[PDB]
Amino acid sequence: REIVHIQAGQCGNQIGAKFWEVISDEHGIDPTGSYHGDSDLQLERINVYYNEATGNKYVPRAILVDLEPGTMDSVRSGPFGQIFRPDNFVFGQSGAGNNWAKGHYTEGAELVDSVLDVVRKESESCDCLQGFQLTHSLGGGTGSGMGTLLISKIREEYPDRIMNTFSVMPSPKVSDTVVEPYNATLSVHQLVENTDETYCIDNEALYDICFRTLKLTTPTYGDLNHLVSATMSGVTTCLRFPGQLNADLRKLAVNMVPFPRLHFFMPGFAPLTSQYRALTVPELTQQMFDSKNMMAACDPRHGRYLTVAAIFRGRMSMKEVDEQMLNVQNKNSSYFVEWIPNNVKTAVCDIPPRGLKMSATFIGNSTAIQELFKRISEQFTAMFRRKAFLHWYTGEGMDEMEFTEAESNMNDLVSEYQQYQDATA
Amino acid sequence: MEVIELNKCTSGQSFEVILKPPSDPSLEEIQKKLEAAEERRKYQEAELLKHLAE
Amino acid sequence: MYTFVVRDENSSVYAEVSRLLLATGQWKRLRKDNPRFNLMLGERNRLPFGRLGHEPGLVQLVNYYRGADKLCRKASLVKLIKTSPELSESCTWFPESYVIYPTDEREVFLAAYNRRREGREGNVWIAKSSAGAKGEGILISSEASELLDFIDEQGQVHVIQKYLEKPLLLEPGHRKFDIRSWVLVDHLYNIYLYREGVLRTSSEPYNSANFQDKTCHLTNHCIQKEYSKNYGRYEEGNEMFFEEFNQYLMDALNTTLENSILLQIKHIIRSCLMCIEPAISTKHLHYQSFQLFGFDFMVDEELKVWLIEVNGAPACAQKLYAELCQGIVDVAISSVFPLATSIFIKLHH
Amino acid sequence: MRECISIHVGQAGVQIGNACWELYCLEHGIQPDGQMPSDKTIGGGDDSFNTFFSETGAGKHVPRAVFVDLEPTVIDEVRTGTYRQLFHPEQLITGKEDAANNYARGHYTIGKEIIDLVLDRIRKLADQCTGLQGFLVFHSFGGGTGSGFTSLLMERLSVDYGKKSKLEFSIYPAPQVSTAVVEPYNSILTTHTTLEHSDCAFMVDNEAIYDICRRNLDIERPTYTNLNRLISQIVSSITASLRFDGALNVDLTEFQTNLVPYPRIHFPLATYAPVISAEKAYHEQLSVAEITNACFEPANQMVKCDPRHGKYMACCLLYRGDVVPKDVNAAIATIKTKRSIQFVDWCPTGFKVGINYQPPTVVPGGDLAKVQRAVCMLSNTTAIAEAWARLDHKFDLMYAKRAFVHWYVGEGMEEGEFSEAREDMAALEKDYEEVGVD
Numbered sequence A: 001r002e003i004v005h006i007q008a009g010q011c012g013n014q015i016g017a018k019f020w021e022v023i024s025d026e027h028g029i030d031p032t033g034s035y036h037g038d039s040d041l042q043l044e045r046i047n048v049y050y051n052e053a054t055g056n057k058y059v060p061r062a063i064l065v066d067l068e069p070g071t072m073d074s075v076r077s078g079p080f081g082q083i084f085r086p087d088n089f090v091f092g093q094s095g096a097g098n099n100w101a102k103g104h105y106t107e108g109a110e111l112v113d114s115v116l117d118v119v120r121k122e123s124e125s126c127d128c129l130q131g132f133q134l135t136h137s138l139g140g141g142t143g144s145g146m147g148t149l150l151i152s153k154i155r156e157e158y159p160d161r162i163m164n165t166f167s168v169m170p171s172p173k174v175s176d177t178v179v180e181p182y183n184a185t186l187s188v189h190q191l192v193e194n195t196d197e198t199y200c201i202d203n204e205a206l207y208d209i210c211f212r213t214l215k216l217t218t219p220t221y222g223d224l225n226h227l228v229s230a231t232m233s234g235v236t237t238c239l240r241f242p243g244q245l246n247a248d249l250r251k252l253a254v255n256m257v258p259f260p261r262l263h264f265f266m267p268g269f270a271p272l273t274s275q276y277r278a279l280t281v282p283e284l285t286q287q288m289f290d291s292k293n294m295m296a297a298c299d300p301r302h303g304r305y306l307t308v309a310a311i312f313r314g315r316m317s318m319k320e321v322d323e324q325m326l327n328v329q330n331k332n333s334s335y336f337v338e339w340i341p342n343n344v345k346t347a348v349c350d351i352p353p354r355g356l357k358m359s360a361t362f363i364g365n366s367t368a369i370q371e372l373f374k375r376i377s378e379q380f381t382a383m384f385r386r387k388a389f390l391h392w393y394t395g396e397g398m399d400e401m402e403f404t405e406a407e408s409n410m411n412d413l414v415s416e417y418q419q420y421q422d423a424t425a
Numbered sequence B: 001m002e003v004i005e006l007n008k009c010t011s012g013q014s015f016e017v018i019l020k021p022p023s024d025p026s027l028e029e030i031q032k033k034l035e036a037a038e039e040r041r042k043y044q045e046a047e048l049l050k051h052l053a054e
Numbered sequence C: 001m002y003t004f005v006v007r008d009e010n011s012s013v014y015a016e017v018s019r020l021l022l023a024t025g026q027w028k029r030l031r032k033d034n035p036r037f038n039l040m041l042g043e044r045n046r047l048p049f050g051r052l053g054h055e056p057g058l059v060q061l062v063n064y065y066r067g068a069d070k071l072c073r074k075a076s077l078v079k080l081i082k083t084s085p086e087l088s089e090s091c092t093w094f095p096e097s098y099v100i101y102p103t104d105e106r107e108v109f110l111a112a113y114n115r116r117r118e119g120r121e122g123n124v125w126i127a128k129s130s131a132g133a134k135g136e137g138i139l140i141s142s143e144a145s146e147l148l149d150f151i152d153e154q155g156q157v158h159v160i161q162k163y164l165e166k167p168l169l170l171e172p173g174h175r176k177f178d179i180r181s182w183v184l185v186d187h188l189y190n191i192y193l194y195r196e197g198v199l200r201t202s203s204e205p206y207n208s209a210n211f212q213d214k215t216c217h218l219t220n221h222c223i224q225k226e227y228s229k230n231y232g233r234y235e236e237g238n239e240m241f242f243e244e245f246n247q248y249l250m251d252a253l254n255t256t257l258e259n260s261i262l263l264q265i266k267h268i269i270r271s272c273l274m275c276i277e278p279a280i281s282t283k284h285l286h287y288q289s290f291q292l293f294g295f296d297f298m299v300d301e302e303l304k305v306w307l308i309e310v311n312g313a314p315a316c317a318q319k320l321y322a323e324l325c326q327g328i329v330d331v332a333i334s335s336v337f338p339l340a341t342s343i344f345i346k347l348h349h
Numbered sequence D: 001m002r003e004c005i006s007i008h009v010g011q012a013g014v015q016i017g018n019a020c021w022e023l024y025c026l027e028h029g030i031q032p033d034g035q036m037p038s039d040k041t042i043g044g045g046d047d048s049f050n051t052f053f054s055e056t057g058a059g060k061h062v063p064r065a066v067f068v069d070l071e072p073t074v075i076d077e078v079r080t081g082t083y084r085q086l087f088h089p090e091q092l093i094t095g096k097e098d099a100a101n102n103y104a105r106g107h108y109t110i111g112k113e114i115i116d117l118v119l120d121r122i123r124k125l126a127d128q129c130t131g132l133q134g135f136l137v138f139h140s141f142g143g144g145t146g147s148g149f150t151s152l153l154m155e156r157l158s159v160d161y162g163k164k165s166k167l168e169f170s171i172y173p174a175p176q177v178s179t180a181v182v183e184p185y186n187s188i189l190t191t192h193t194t195l196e197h198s199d200c201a202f203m204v205d206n207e208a209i210y211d212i213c214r215r216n217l218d219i220e221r222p223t224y225t226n227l228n229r230l231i232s233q234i235v236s237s238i239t240a241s242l243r244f245d246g247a248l249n250v251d252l253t254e255f256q257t258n259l260v261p262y263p264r265i266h267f268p269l270a271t272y273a274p275v276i277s278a279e280k281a282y283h284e285q286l287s288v289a290e291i292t293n294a295c296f297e298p299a300n301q302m303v304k305c306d307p308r309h310g311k312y313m314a315c316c317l318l319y320r321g322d323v324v325p326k327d328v329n330a331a332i333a334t335i336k337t338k339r340s341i342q343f344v345d346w347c348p349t350g351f352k353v354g355i356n357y358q359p360p361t362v363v364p365g366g367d368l369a370k371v372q373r374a375v376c377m378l379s380n381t382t383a384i385a386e387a388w389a390r391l392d393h394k395f396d397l398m399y400a401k402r403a404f405v406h407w408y409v410g411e412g413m414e415e416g417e418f419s420e421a422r423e424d425m426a427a428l429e430k431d432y433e434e435v436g437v438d
């Protein structure tokens, strides 16, 4: 059951690279693609993310996309740069200048076809294609504009395959341009319609974590990507490593998404790292449920959990996890919907991430995620009620009403989230 | 409390003890409803592919 | 901390139990239908017993015993007594009683009726139900057929019980009374009797020939507080507690409350509750139960105690709500969910 | 002699089937190669063990079994396993992608593309049956294949084999060992469409097996392996009368006759004792009366309920190993005196009993200790309706908000099959109450 990975834009490609650095090290594959590990468990589910090639080498099933060559020259340059099949580097030259319209309608359309040609050639070589995953930001132009364009094109060719994304949200605390709320609102509406799971990675939270708790005075995009790569690995371990779970992308979607449009998860991780003291299991669980470990800058206690999933990595007492997980639920049982019985599910995998003997990844589907969309929505209107900076978009063909609709669709989404937050049995 | 119908053999025995006495659809209409849900699916996929064409 | 829910809002007793548990600082109340609870204080009818004990990692406890209705509903009460060898046709503390349907005991009843008509015995009788609240649907005749047609007057079942002609009557007043005792059975089937009881007085003087009188005979708290002038003269609320009844018996009859009556009360309590112990005990079950019962007795003039009924959803006397509700927590609840002398007489078995 | 064919569906059905057939071989002296030294009728016969095994000219003894999953990961472990030689490839059927815990995906979408094939591989086994009895179908309530495809199969076996009996072994869902929250949906839909196609079903609440494994084997967190080897012991004692010389329940027809007066109410409660750990080096072996009275402790039941607050319709006792009729009556007499065992008035208050002298066989290296005598009791009590109530409630809660329904509609189902199926168990829940309260 193979997965096809796509990374688009600067952010999309640099978190994407760190992801492949991390898991490639976990499965024991070196920067050349040659496996040199200690366990057979490292390779049993290696076909999920790796094509096996001539001469015992493993090449990620990954497609690298950008509308300018800048950072993908840097990817090819980086630690694991030469791991990727070079045919899968697909890029234009003009760049998208942080413009959703350029990525989705003009500059991106010129190149989208070339990308899906590589998609098809990875799919055709797939025993049974399970689904796609994308890494990208929503505040730029390529990852946002083109990224959502490819997703729409992939749903057209593969209408019955799962499409999940890792999506970086823009926050003023970590801002490139002022038009980010425009690009993110236009993308969210695309994600509402054509993705099964979207992991909301808020750059605000990633900043707060890096500065408040990790106590790093001036966080870099690198320091924020360490948190993303560790979470992306933690999430993907249900499939990357053999539990006695029969984990399937579709199956996991079915068990966490009670309503089609409400598929935006809050990620989390513990322990938060940048030390040697072994961390108790009771400490792992109380951290992952604390908002300070949330990658989405929302308080879980102003909403209610629709579904939850917790992944524990390491050698630990599966009886102590069951004990303390069922303990936290009652410290917070007011914050779990009562009309979805047994909506907190736990998984364990023996192999831990490199550097820590014990880790936990938190995947929450909370109605408190609306706080994120409300935040983006206010920044959006603040400028749109004055048509500020619209000329950058209307010059590429868009009309104001496409903006009005996109705004309306997410104000709808926020309303849908609060329907189920007040709802009771 | 009666014992009755005691049958035995080399593998075992059996009996009954009483303590007190007392006081389908077709083939064609299945594979039609399998087909009635196949078209409900192709109609939903058409409305999507129509939506994407818009 | 511990978790509990409340599904009987009109319950006077467990109202303060819930409030007293909240003041613990170690108990958290949840919404009526959240399933992740350690304790349920459930509705009186159709309590979903089958839904309990299936929540992983949560020991659940409930304030009612599935099957206890066979003791707390007068029709099955009678059936339990005459059908069970442990109690038997041969039961000296329960009045002669018959269940009659408007399985049926219609002519086994008149059989015993004219054997008394014959011999000039007291052919006193009364018919009853658990359906009629507020002393409704009662009928104390001396001839048999006047009630049988008042029985099938209505469409539900009524038991016919020998009425006690010679009750013991306190003085001053020549008044009748009944005794309510509160017994709590915890999860290990320990039988705890509350040391405090109540005499639910009648303030009328008793009149043999005049069974016309609604209030000359019937003693429960509402029929003398809204049907009788004399409510409150001799004692506050037509309620005499155990210290006064003891001293009165001492001064008046040269005996004790323990000796003359309480020994028989403790005998009847434990005889009834262990007759059914096999059918309701939650010893090895996935959920556990406790339940507070109200036992109602009557005393005839020979200082013999008779059992009149057992109530499953009982109300306390307002002076003791504090002491009783606190005892429930210590024994029935925190016994299972521990925290950071005794008011009960243990009836051993 | 009349043959019976077992069908194992989905992960739970397949893995359990693997555990049962393992035990059957140890019991009948069959080896992992299909060779039965003690069988002297080479390449043929009509013994009672031949009801579950066929024979080849080369002396191979082959289960009359069929495995079927919509994804190959689990049946692949059978094709590489210790008993790989036992089965032949046409009996093991695999799709490529599963039903993702979606009844609609298992029944409608992926179902129809594989239903004809399965039935073809089923008939390749019935064609070698001189006088076929029927089928024993293993499956979970919660899986999308286990629930969805089984109900489709059971529908067309009732037409392609209208006169043959069909018994179910069903795994009722428990959250302690399950990672899926839509299992209440799948169980309701499959029970509703399967109900008038199954003659008798034994349902096993994983919750009960779990706690039995924890209490009486002191395994802190049981695995599926722990659960299945215990489950197959129960299943083994239930089918032993078909595989061994005897006079009781020698035919799948007798199961409905002895245990099922009303057809809808065909879910007998199974209780089993004793369960003893193999780490308890040695143990004070329990009498007949001790194990027989253990059959009325809810803590040994396959579904947690309270049979004191229901009424019985039928009761079998299947002792294994070393028991004599007179020690049973001794026990039965003592139990009536101390237990609340009320029958429906329109049925006798009696116990059909069966004894086979071979003690329970147990897997070498398993977690279960060898015992001198064991019993499995089959009670058709109305108290099992508690399990339906629990399930139906969890269904009411989510469906009132239509949670997860879009997943089923997207695979072709209609929202009405939900309430149509829920209405059925509304009748089933009340059918039970009519029969067992006053």
Ligand SMILES: Nc1nc2c(ncn2[C@@H]2O[C@H](COP(=O)(O)OP(=O)(O)OP(=O)(O)O)[C@@H](O)[C@H]2O)c(=O)[nH]1
Pocket: D009, D010, D011, D012, D013, D015, D016, D069, D070, D098, D099, D100, D101, D102, D106, D140, D141, D142, D143, D144, D145, D146, D147, D171, D173, D174, D177, D178, D179, D180, D183, D206, D224, D227, D228, D231
């Ligand atoms: N007793 C027991 N239960 C199992 C076993 N495997 C899965 N289950 C239970 O069955 C449910 C999952 O259903 P599965 O059988 O795995 O699903 P399936 O039949 O393969 O159908 P799919 O949804 O397509 O995978 C969970 O509730 C488990 O508790 C097993 O080996 N033994």
Ligand SMILES: Nc1ncnc2c1ncn2[C@@H]1O[C@H](COP(=O)(O)OP(=O)(O)CP(=O)(O)O)[C@@H](O)[C@H]1O
Pocket: C095, C126, C128, C130, C132, C133, C134, C135, C161, C162, C163, C164, C165, C177, C178, C217, C218, C219, C220, C296, C298, C308, C309, C311
């Ligand atoms: N056999 C009998 N002889 C004399 N008096 C009797 C009697 N049976 C009942 N009574 C009288 O009837 C009165 C109340 O009857 P009963 O208690 O059974 O109704 P009830 O259950 O609706 C009130 P509660 O629920 O508060 O206990 C008693 O106080 C008692 O004095």
Ligand SMILES: Nc1nc2c(ncn2[C@@H]2O[C@H](COP(=O)(O)OP(=O)(O)O)[C@@H](O)[C@H]2O)c(=O)[nH]1
Pocket: A008, A009, A010, A011, A012, A014, A015, A096, A097, A098, A137, A138, A139, A140, A141, A142, A143, A144, A168, A169, A170, A171, A174, A175, A176, A177, A180, A203, A221, A222, A224, A225
């Ligand atoms: N976490 C993270 N976010 C980034 C990174 N680079 C850009 N972003 C985010 O995306 C915005 C810039 O968008 P960008 O990725 O350059 O868009 P694109 O390259 O044109 O597709 C800012 O709001 C950043 O927060 C990165 O390396 N890490």
Ligand SMILES: COc1cccc(-c2cc(NCc3ccc4c(c3)OCO4)nc(N)n2)c1
Pocket: A132, A133, A134, A164, A165, A197, A235, A236, A237, A238, A239, A245, A247, A252, A253, A255, A256, A309, A310, A311, A345, A346, A347, A363, D179, D180
């Ligand atoms: C690109 O997108 C991906 C890629 C890889 C994995 C996931 C993923 C993981 C996950 N883990 C929790 C979890 C839930 C239910 C479970 C469980 C584990 O084990 C059994 O039942 N949940 C979901 N919804 N998606 C998403």
Ligand SMILES: [Ca+2]
Pocket: A110
């Ligand atoms: Ca151009």
Ligand SMILES: [Ca+2]
Pocket: A113
């Ligand atoms: Ca092209």
Ligand SMILES: [Ca+2]
Pocket: D039, D040, D041, D042, D043, D044, D045, D047, D055
């Ligand atoms: Ca032979």
Ligand SMILES: [Ca+2]
Pocket: B024, D158, D162, D196, D197
């Ligand atoms: Ca049939």
Ligand SMILES: [Mg+2]
Pocket: A010, A140, A176
């Ligand atoms: Mg940039």
Ligand SMILES: [Mg+2]
Pocket: C130, C311
């Ligand atoms: Mg009453």
Ligand SMILES: [Mg+2]
Pocket: A246, D010, D011, D069, D071, D098, D143, D145
């Ligand atoms: Mg499966």
